[PDB]
Amino acid sequence: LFGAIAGFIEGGWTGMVDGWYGYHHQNEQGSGYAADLKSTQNAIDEITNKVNSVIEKMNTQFTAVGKEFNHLEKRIENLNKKIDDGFLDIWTYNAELLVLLENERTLDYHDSNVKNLYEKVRSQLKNNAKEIGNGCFEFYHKCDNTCMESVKNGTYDYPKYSEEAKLNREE
């Protein structure tokens, strides 16, 4: 577990409908939600792959399970029952544990993505913004819609805003 989902970012957003992870901005021009398209798309690809793997690796033989035995063939009839039950016990156990393990990992996968999205942003702004906690950043400067998007695709210009920011931070 990476500590983000139900962690330092304590809740989800029913408001963000077009993706799994994203942003909520609030500036002068308005507020709203936008899903991060790139990392959402990547995740749906990888999770699709996981499901398809668990399904498609199952090699399956044409076979007829049933067998018929005569009243003087209880032993082999019971032998046959032993093999059917044995397979039942291994497939049941494996399937249950597979689901339990993968679920645990899928949930942590998502946690990891959210945490990396957060760090991707902290990394960029540095001390041009205040970490409020709860996954939010308060800018020490005006950040308009173009500024906001420079952040969303990794092209934030730190030096551009450093003076403005440091004035509001300190004096």
Partner: protein, 323 residues
Amino acid sequence: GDTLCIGYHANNSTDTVDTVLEKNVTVTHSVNLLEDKHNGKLCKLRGVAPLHLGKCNIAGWILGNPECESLSTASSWSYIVETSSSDNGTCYPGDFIDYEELREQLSSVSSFERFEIFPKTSSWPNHDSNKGVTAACPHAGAKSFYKNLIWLVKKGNSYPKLSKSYINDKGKEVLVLWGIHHPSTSADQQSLYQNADAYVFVGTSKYSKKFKPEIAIRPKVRDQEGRMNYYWTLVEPGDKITFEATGNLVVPRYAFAMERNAGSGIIISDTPVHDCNTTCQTPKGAINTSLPFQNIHPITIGKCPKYVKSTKLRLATGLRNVP
């Protein structure tokens, strides 16, 4: 101040999954990995229909019990279906030898043709081929017998040594069945075959067996104190089968040219059969699925999901759901 926040999706969803650490965790998205739905029908497997017997056993059907010729006889099937009402079989009581092995071998054939190996009209000029009929196998109210065998009996006061061969020219293997009859008493043996001390011999390249009548009174079954044992063999292409007898031989009339398949099976079920395509069949119905597991039935035929005992196998795809 102006603020940017990182967050994650939440929604309507009420699906729960389990993990090793936690039970009943609500997730945003999710997929079931366990197939639990069937179509309630018996279907064609790899596009070829099953043989459906209705009123009859396999025994009833290959011997040609009089009740079993309402069945249109196809040259191809992918498996065989008997019902809980499949009751007409050997109407004259006796053992059917290696019966289970016969049903296995007959499971699935890619080609199957019934033909008259020993034509009734010309095969037995020195023996009676018409009075071989019993209250144990009734047809339209009257005493009858199996369609695929003939019960030969003496003509006048004589049962001369019978001798008859067939060479398998069919190019496939042919299934031939015959019976041997065990009278109740000496008076009955003599009455039907003349010769006390009769014998039967049947032979091929690989098969050889002598049969003698076991004369005694058994407990009455369908009004009979005697018994008939039923036998069968597969004659290979090019091989020959010969019958020799001084009484008691219930002779083949029709045999079967066929090409065996591979592992299919017999399902016993009252599920109705449909024009309908499947790749996995169970006694309850067919399964059309991509999924690796099913909990519908342990005994399936075809290319099937693995049978398991679980009731749900829900895989998380989305994240924990925290509205």
